[PDB]
């Protein structure tokens, strides 16, 4: 599962996930893409699982472009500790997902096999997704 | 136990007199760490880069020079 090789800071504020994804919202690396129409978090484990189910299905024909990278560390308190005593320990990494974000792109595969692969990947993710095609403006 | 609990007292820096206000000689205009504002006419600078009015007049901020510096000056 993906992870930054290094970061400036270990722990990070929680923040608010708000707004739409106007940046990573266009098919730019391949011909078909899966796009999140709902908001949430995407752990690195989910990214690995969805990539595995897509790649095993399309059977190595065509390239897969992972367009999300998990760069936000998430902490957790150990079990049976009270509420003070500093911030919890890093457990896993997530990517914040705004509606409109491209998650995976497939290049070099026909539409039906890629749509099968994307349907298989959607059942591994915690938000609703859609299948979008590359257009010209 | 973690190792983060420290901070320093506030320093109360910033612009004290805004553009258009009247000043007398000796009135402090800007408390700043470096020179984010530079002294123009009728404005002096203290050892800690404090900008103060050396004359009566009204305060006026500008952007001048080829380095695009922010200048405070006092109009007499």
């Amino acid at each position: 599962m993906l992870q930054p090789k290094r970061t400036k800071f270990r722990k990070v504020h929680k923040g608010r996930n708000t707004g739409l994804a106007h940046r990573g919202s266009t098919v730019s690396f391949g011909s078909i893409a899966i796009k999140a129409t709902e908001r949430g978090r995407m752990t690195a484990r989910q990214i690995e699982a969805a990539r595995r189910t897509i790649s095993r299905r399309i059977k190595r024909g065509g390239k897969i472009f992972i367009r999300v990278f998990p760069d936000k560390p998430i902490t957790e308190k150990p079990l049976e500790v009270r509420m003070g005593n500093g911030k919890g320990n890093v457990e896993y990494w997530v990517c914040e997902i705004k509606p409109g974000k491209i998650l995976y792109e497939i290049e070099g595969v026909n539409e039906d096999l890629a749509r099968e692969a994307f349907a298989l990947a959607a059942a591994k993710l915690p938000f609703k997704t859609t299948i979008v095609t590359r257009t010209v403006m | 136990s973690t190792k983060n609990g420290r901070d320093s007292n506030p320093k109360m820096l910033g612009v004290k007199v805004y553009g258009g206000q009247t000043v007398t000689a000796g009135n402090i205009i800007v408390r700043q760490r470096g020179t984010e504002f530079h002294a123009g006419a009728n404005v002096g600078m203290g050892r800690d880069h404090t900008l103060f009015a050396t004359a009566d007049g009204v305060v006026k901020f500008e952007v001048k020079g080829q380095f695009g510096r922010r200048y405070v000056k006092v109009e007499t």
């Binding site: 739409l20 994804a21 106007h22 705004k98 509606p99 409109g100 979008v132 403006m137 | -």
Partner: protein, 96 residues
């Protein structure tokens, strides 16, 4: 050949709220500029435009807009799509 039928979009139909009202009544704001005339703001019908958008000649041809007894020979310059739902939000047209 493509022909789009438009209406004039005066101010009081411009800005955030009026644009959202337009898009609720199945309309698209658009703008026409280029040449030496001034920009003209127009309202297009969403179904007409999303049908023209399906074709590829629509992006390589000179299309025509009719604001009402006025021809306008333009080329599509920029599209703005809603990020989540792919519906077009606004269109740019360059006089041709």
């Amino acid at each position: 050949n493509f022909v789009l039928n438009a209406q004039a979009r005066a101010e009081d139909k411009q800005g955030k709220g009026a644009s959202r009202r337009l898009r609720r009544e199945s309309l698209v704001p658009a703008i026409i500029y280029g040449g030496n005339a001034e920009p003209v703001a127009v309202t297009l019908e969403l179904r007409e435009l999303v049908k023209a958008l399906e074709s590829n000649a629509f992006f390589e041809e000179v299309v025509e807009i009719k604001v009402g007894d006025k021809v306008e020979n333009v080329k599509i310059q920029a599209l703005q799509r809603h990020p989540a739902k792919n519906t077009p939000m606004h269109a740019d047209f360059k006089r041709a």
